Design a protein around this ligand. Structure first.
Ligand code: AI2
Ligand code: AI2
Lengths: 329, 210, 339, 203
């Protein structure tokens, strides 16, 4: 099972204390490392890669830059995935990974139960309930459910009750549940929206394209499509162009550069934009506190802004300023 | 050890549902179930479930049903036995809003309250990734002979009583022992093991007697 | 797992004695109830009795008669469904029987569906359970057994048919099998026959079909089977309706060269026997399982022990039996239900 | 702590896979076209996908006899004649049978079960699918039983006679010491019937 982000913080007042302290450090200027180390610390990162979404790439750039600014001595070695075994051997001080599939679970459990490596889980902010004895060093991301609720609140404004929509999920797993089913449930509960169809995808632009075609060929009568990730959203944008259905509103999920360009063209109508660099900065601040023998919160979530195609190019530019403060340089 | 019996008991309970869930996952990939969404041929569907429950009695749910994205499109007709009318079935469908997780549900029926573990699973079209709808499985815990017999037999305790808060819902008592269920409830080595569903502790407890 | 009927009685010698005692009371003339009751007993019957087979119709007729002749004060709620149909009605009737706290619920056990219902009634405080048309106690339920399993042992009757086909036909004879629907009946009637015929006579099974336990379903499976495997000398049918459906199929295709059995020997089967349309059947001494139930209830009311299980007996009947032989069997079989 | 639940769970897992696979269009199709490559790959998929829950051998029959087996049976002493008698011994479907047979390379202790292969539209029984677990020298199962029950070692015994164990060979004891150090006895129940089989755990 999973705790909800706020649920976890409410359940553990000490964890809210700690998450608030981290949010503040992330906000304020870099206060460099108190305890210098004997060696350079070793960090392995295993990320998705080959994505139109720049989340992972920008996250590393934001992470390294904050590490440099805090005066941490690190050896960072990275892998982007088209072997977790090949990562295990390198005996690192901090492993940065993700958790979406049951395949990731299997590994994380093994890493938690049979190693010493401090584990950071990126793109999940909902602690596993069964691990309350031995939680990962840090869950860090932009809370999927919060972002979906924000998109849901907006759609709930643009369309009257009983409006028709379809859903393009991620691949099967955690992301689909917390982005897709969260949105479905709220919009159904609150707005009496009616779901016509839903499709799992292969988490690529190609499959995003294919799924939208398949969806619209079978259920042409929707007012919007909700997409659960960046690449899937942009695939669906093409399919909508091709079929000439820009009467159909569609969202992005994350608000990276490629999404922002598409927003500005009116290819995407709305997105939930994450203050991207904060989670790269959080992981550096978390590593620093660890090196200073300070307690580190189990969970960190960054903030979002809602972005629409109606927004000024100045609004967009001011958001790119906050969100990519590090990874844009 | 009181904690070793408690861990044993929860492992048995957990592995009973883990097997029902494996079974449900697996059968839910059937082409017959998939095709039902297009064909709506109820003879073919019923024959199929008849066939898998004959193959596996101890892992068959008490009742099952199919939905699309608006509602229940088919039920197996078993739920009525347990006081679960159409109305209450819908409420079950609506309470289970996430896939691949057991939900503990306590509902009132015209014959009393019913205590159930219910889960859903998406039915996909593997050539498109389309979610055609959902398959639900419900286990009724009330007077659940087979589960009381598993807990007793595989833990080597003498008897079990399942309670909600502390109304008795099921037990393994033969009727020839020094004690009845009421005596067990009155808290000779009786051990309380709380029932955890989806990593959250429920109102249910297993009481073991040695 | 199930205990075989004799296997169960050999395992618990006390049960043999109880069953023996019950057979005597069924054979003998009615000794009325010796302890009158403060109110009528509430009896609920839920049977798949809407069939061409009169087994369930006659089981209740004879049961009621004996209850009458036993001076037992009762109320009987009776619901009949089609096999594999009226599912909602069946679940509702069972629910209503338990809700109204029937003293006896009379039901059956063929499928996992029936089994699940029965498992939920086992620890009942108010309702005793009689399972008709099964005589093989469930092992898992030892020490929590229903009040009574009552019927005509499916295996014994299949053994008797298998012995007879073993004599009619030469080794390596080709046959097909029309089962009931999936479940206990198909397993104990069908697989018993197949097994014995294969090991004792090397008969060679050419095809087998599960059916929907109906005439139409028997017709359809018979036609499909013979289309693919026309070269069989006999068809073993696992039930009455299925057999009579197959009868229509062989006629439609001009094929009474193929021998076909019935299973049970009620009125419609007997008419088809004497007409030449069925070649053989295993005939149940029908009314004994209705009577055994009434006698079992009487004993419970007089606070006597009641056997866990009771099986009646069969006679073999062929189309070469005299109108004399049948008529005399009908007077044994339908002693209450015909009267 | 009980290996009883883990043991039973293991065979329940095997059974669930077998029931499900036997409903596959792949197996139904093999009855008509006999493409042994398609079939062998189908079972390769499932096997490497779940190496922990797979029978030591499989075979298929039609009503006349065995039409295919996976090649594994003979390595256990289960020759064509013995395979044939196995098929006939397992005369009811959907149930585990505990079978012990003499082979030319020693006694063999097995659990066998069959499931009918049906046309889901016509109701035809095409034949049966069997799965067998050889218990003798089943190291992987012994290893699973050992680690999942947090005990030091496990020995499987058929009527006081060892037939499999998890011993590494370096511990301050042998299998003989186990049969006469805390050893516990857990008898095996098959299809509601207690068998001669017993699991001996050590801590
Ligand atoms: C970070 C991310 O989560 C899923 C996918 O990996 C992603 O990169 O795509 B996205 O920008 O919607 O969000
Ligand atoms: C009693 C019975 O068992 C199955 C079916 O219900 C039946 O009526 O058909 B039959 O007469 O062969 O026997």
């Amino acid at each position: 099972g999973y705790w909800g982000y706020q649920e976890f913080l409410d359940e553990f007042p000490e964890q809210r204390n700690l998450t608030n302290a981290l949010s503040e450090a992330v906000r304020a200027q870099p206060v460099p490392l108190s305890k210098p180390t004997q060696r350079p610390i070793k960090i392995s990162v295993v990320y998705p890669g080959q994505q139109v979404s720049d989340y992972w790439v920008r996250n590393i750039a934001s992470f390294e830059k904050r590490l440099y600014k805090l005066n941490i001595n690190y050896q960072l070695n990275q892998v982007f995935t088209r072997s977790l075994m090949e990562a295990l051997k390198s005996k690192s001080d901090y492993l940065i990974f993700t958790l979406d599939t049951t395949r990731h679970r299997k590994f994380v459990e093994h890493v938690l139960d049979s190693t010493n490596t401090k584990l950071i889980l990126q793109n999940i902010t909902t602690p596993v309930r069964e691990w309350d004895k031995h939680q990962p060093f840090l869950y860090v991301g932009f809370d999927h459910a919060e972002g979906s609720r924000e998109l849901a609140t907006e759609f709930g404004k643009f369309f009257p009750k009983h409006t028709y929509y379809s859903v393009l999920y991620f691949s099967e797993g955690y992301i689909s549940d917390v982005r897709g089913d969260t949105f479905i449930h709220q919009v159904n509960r609150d707005n009496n929206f009616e779901l016509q169809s839903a499709y799992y995808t292969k988490a690529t632009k190609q499959s995003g394209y294919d799924a939208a075609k398949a969806s619209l060929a079978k259920h042409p009568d929707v007012d919007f499509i909700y997409a659960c990730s960046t690449d899937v959203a942009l695939g669906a944008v093409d399919a909508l162009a091709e079929l000439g259905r820009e009467d159909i509103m569609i969202n992005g999920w994350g608000g990276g550069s490629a999404e922002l360009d598409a927003i500005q063209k009116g290819d995407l109508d709305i997105t939930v934009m994450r203050m991207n660099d904060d989670t790269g900065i959080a992981m550096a601040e978390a590593i620093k506190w660890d090196l200073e023998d300070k307690p580190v919160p189990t969970v960190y979530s960054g903030d979002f802004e809602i972005v629409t195609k109606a927004d000024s190019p100045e609004r967009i530019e001011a958001l790119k300023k906050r969100a990519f403060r590090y990874s844009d340089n | 050890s009181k904690q070793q019996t408690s861990a044993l008991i929860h492992n048995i309970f957990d592995s009973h549902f883990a097997a029902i869930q494996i079974h449900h996952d697996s059968n839910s990939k059937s082409e017959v179930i998939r095709d039902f969404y297009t064909d709506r041929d109820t003879d073919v569907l019923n024959f199929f479930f008849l066939s898998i429950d004959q193959s596996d009695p101890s892992h068959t749910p008490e009742f099952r049903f199919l939905t699309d994205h608006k509602g229940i499109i088919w039920d197996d007709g078993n739920a009525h036995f347990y006081g679960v009318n159409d109305l209450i079935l819908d409420s079950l469908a609506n309470r289970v809003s996430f896939s691949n997780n057991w939900y503990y549900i306590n509902v009132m029926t015209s014959i009393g309250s019913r205590h159930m573990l219910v889960r859903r699973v998406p039915i996909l079209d593997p050539s498109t990734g389309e979610v055609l709808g959902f398959s639900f499985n419900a286990v009724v815990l009330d007077n659940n002979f087979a589960l009381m017999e598993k807990l007793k037999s595989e833990s080597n305790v003498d008897n079990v009583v399942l309670v909600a808060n502390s109304v008795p819902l099921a037990n393994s008592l033969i009727g020839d022992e020094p004690y009845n269920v009421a005596d067990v409830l009155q808290r000779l080595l009786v051990i309380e093991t709380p029932i955890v569903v989806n990593a959250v502790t429920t109102e249910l407890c297993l009481l073991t007697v040695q």
